[PDB]
Structure formats: structure tokens, C-alpha cells
Amino acid sequence: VRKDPITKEWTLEGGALVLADKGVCLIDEFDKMNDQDRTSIHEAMEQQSISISKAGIVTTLQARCSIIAAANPNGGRYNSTLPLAQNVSLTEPILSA
DNA sequence: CGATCGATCGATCGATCGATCGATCGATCGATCGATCGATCG
């Protein structure tokens, strides 16, 4: 959110997902971010849009981006005897995306 | 007539394990602070 003296209403400036609209968004070390940060990424791939209600601004922006994510398994080594759904903290609904 | 032996059963030492509990280290959600600026007022 940014101020603007010309019109005096709050103006909104987009983040990384808005930039990558009709592009690719790369998230290295995807597991290490918190779930609140990770929740935004999930709804970004599903809806291809950003929904925000902050500073009195309610609007939606286009976020049509492709995602390439790198991560690491729990303990730094992949457990070959357990499924993927039990090797990372990344929850299953986010894996389905 | 009895002297030798290979098998069986009861009992015990012990080496071990499962269920349960409180205690130790740690992730992390919530509270507070701060820094620049803006809107109202004198």
C-alpha cells in the first residue's frame, strides 16, 4: 500500500506474484516459509488471482503465473520407505496444486 | 538279578521388552517496539 497526494485515496502496489502474471514464479526452498506465507501461494495457483482487503482497499489482481519450486525433505534426506506425503511438511492440499 | 544312558518335566536366573509418567529442549504464535510519514489543529 502506498499513499498518493494527487487523489488522496490509498493506492495498491503489487508483489512478486502480480509481476509474474503471464510468466513464471520461482520459489526456491519452498518448505522453509511459514504456512501464512505458503497459504498465499496456494490460493495464487488455484485462483490465478490475488485477493486482498487491507487499508480499506478491496480488489483483485491478475496473477496468472507458473510455479517452479525446490524443497528439501525432513531431516535433509529422503525416506525411501515412506510416501512423499510423509517426507515433507508441505501439506497434501498444497501438493495437489 | 542290577548298572548305564538318553530323554522329559518342573523350576529358576536373567536378559529383555511394553505401558505409563513426568521432565528437558525447542518450534513458533502473540505481544510489543520503532521508524518515517500523514491528517487535524493551533
Curated annotation (Swiss-Prot):
Recorded superkingdom: Eukaryota
Query: Which cell locations does it reside in?
Result: Nucleus
- Miscellaneous comment as given in the Swiss-Prot or TrEMBL entry: Present with 1690 molecules/cell in log phase SD medium.
Tell me the function of this protein.
Acts as a component of the MCM2-7 complex (MCM complex) which is the putative replicative helicase essential for 'once per cell cycle' DNA replication initiation and elongation in eukaryotic cells. The active ATPase sites in the MCM2-7 ring are formed through the interaction surfaces of two neighboring subunits such that a critical structure of a conserved arginine finger motif is provided in trans relative to the ATP-binding site of the Walker A box of the adjacent subunit.
> Which family is it part of?
Belongs to the MCM family.
User: What is the annotated quaternary arrangement, including any partners?
Assistant: Component of the MCM2-7 complex. The complex forms a toroidal hexameric ring with the proposed subunit order MCM2-MCM6-MCM4-MCM7-MCM3-MCM5; loaded onto DNA, forms a head-head double hexamer.
Name of the protein this chain belongs to = DNA replication licensing factor MCM2
Report the source organism.
Answer: Saccharomyces cerevisiae (strain ATCC 204508 / S288c)
Species lineage: Eukaryota, Fungi, Dikarya, Ascomycota, Saccharomycotina
Q: Which gene encodes it?
A: MCM2
Report which part of the complete sequence is shown: 580 to 676 of 868
